[PDB]
């Protein structure tokens, strides 16, 4: 958990303009969060990037988890290996509001972070899930009580988030 270059937004939420794969490789945190779907198919966005950085080891492990346990629920999570990126990966399913999943479930999704004292994470339901990223940061601040280090790849989005918050 050798985090550096973060800006503290609240007592427990930190933010950085960084690629989450590069942060994970540098810091080797105890927990990296994946923005997953219910079948843990890591095809694009942050999930595709983390899986590619494990050279598809995350996808083979995820398929075995699904074969034995079934899919996750929207707002749910599971803990799997973090491979070369972290001790553990917490796979969390935010709602896909573009497909009619309820935005109320974004609070349930962020509640999974509270089971871990320190996490490196992306914003949930941003990107192809369709939630407004600034609303997702507000839900993170209002819900997460443990220490979360958020990595935002896009500089234009990062500047917008820091301006709306601090
Ligand atoms: C080059 C490998 N690293 C990465 N590939 C991506 C792809 C998408 C993203 C996304 C967001 C983010 O900053 O969390 C919000 C919307 C999609 C981030 C990354 S880091």
UniProtKB/Swiss-Prot annotation:
Localisation: Host endoplasmic reticulum membrane
Source domain of life: Viruses
Reaction(s) catalysed by this chain's protein: Thiol-dependent hydrolysis of ester, thioester, amide, peptide and isopeptide bonds formed by the C-terminal Gly of ubiquitin (a 76-residue protein attached to proteins as an intracellular targeting signal)
Regulation of its function: Inhibited in vitro by GRL-0617.
Domain Macro: 1-166
Membrane topology qualifier: Multi-pass membrane protein
Quaternary structure and partners: May form homohexamers. Interacts with N protein.
Function per UniProt: Responsible for the cleavages located at the N-terminus of the replicase polyprotein. Participates together with nsp4 in the assembly of virally-induced cytoplasmic double-membrane vesicles necessary for viral replication. Antagonizes innate immune induction of type I interferon by blocking the phosphorylation, dimerization and subsequent nuclear translocation of host IRF3. Also prevents host NF-kappa-B signaling. In addition, PL-PRO possesses a deubiquitinating/deISGylating activity and processes both 'Lys-48'- and 'Lys-63'-linked polyubiquitin chains from cellular substrates.
Protein name: Papain-like protease nsp3
Organism, as annotated: Severe acute respiratory syndrome coronavirus 2
Residue window of the full protein shown: 1026 to 1191 of 7096
């Amino acid at each position: 958990n050798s985090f550096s270059g973060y800006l503290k937004l609240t007592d427990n939420v930190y933010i950085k303009n960084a690629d989450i794969v590069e942060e994970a490789k540098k810091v080797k945190p105890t927990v990296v969060v994946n923005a997953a779907n219910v079948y843990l198919k890591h095809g694009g966005g942050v999930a595709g990037a983390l899986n590619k950085a494990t050279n598809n080891a995350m996808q083979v492990e995820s398929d075995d988890y699904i074969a034995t346990n079934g899919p996750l629920k929207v707002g749910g999570s599971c803990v799997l290996s973090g491979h070369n990126l972290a001790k553990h990966c917490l796979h969390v399913v935010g709602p896909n509001v573009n497909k009619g999943e309820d935005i109320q479930l974004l609070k349930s999704a962020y509640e999974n972070f509270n089971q871990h004292e320190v996490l490196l994470a992306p914003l949930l339901s941003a990107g192809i899930f369709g939630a407004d990223p600034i609303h997702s940061l507000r839900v993170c601040v209002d819900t997460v009580r443990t220490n979360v280090y958020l990595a935002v790849f896009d500089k234009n989005l990062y500047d917008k988030l820091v301006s709306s918050f601090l």
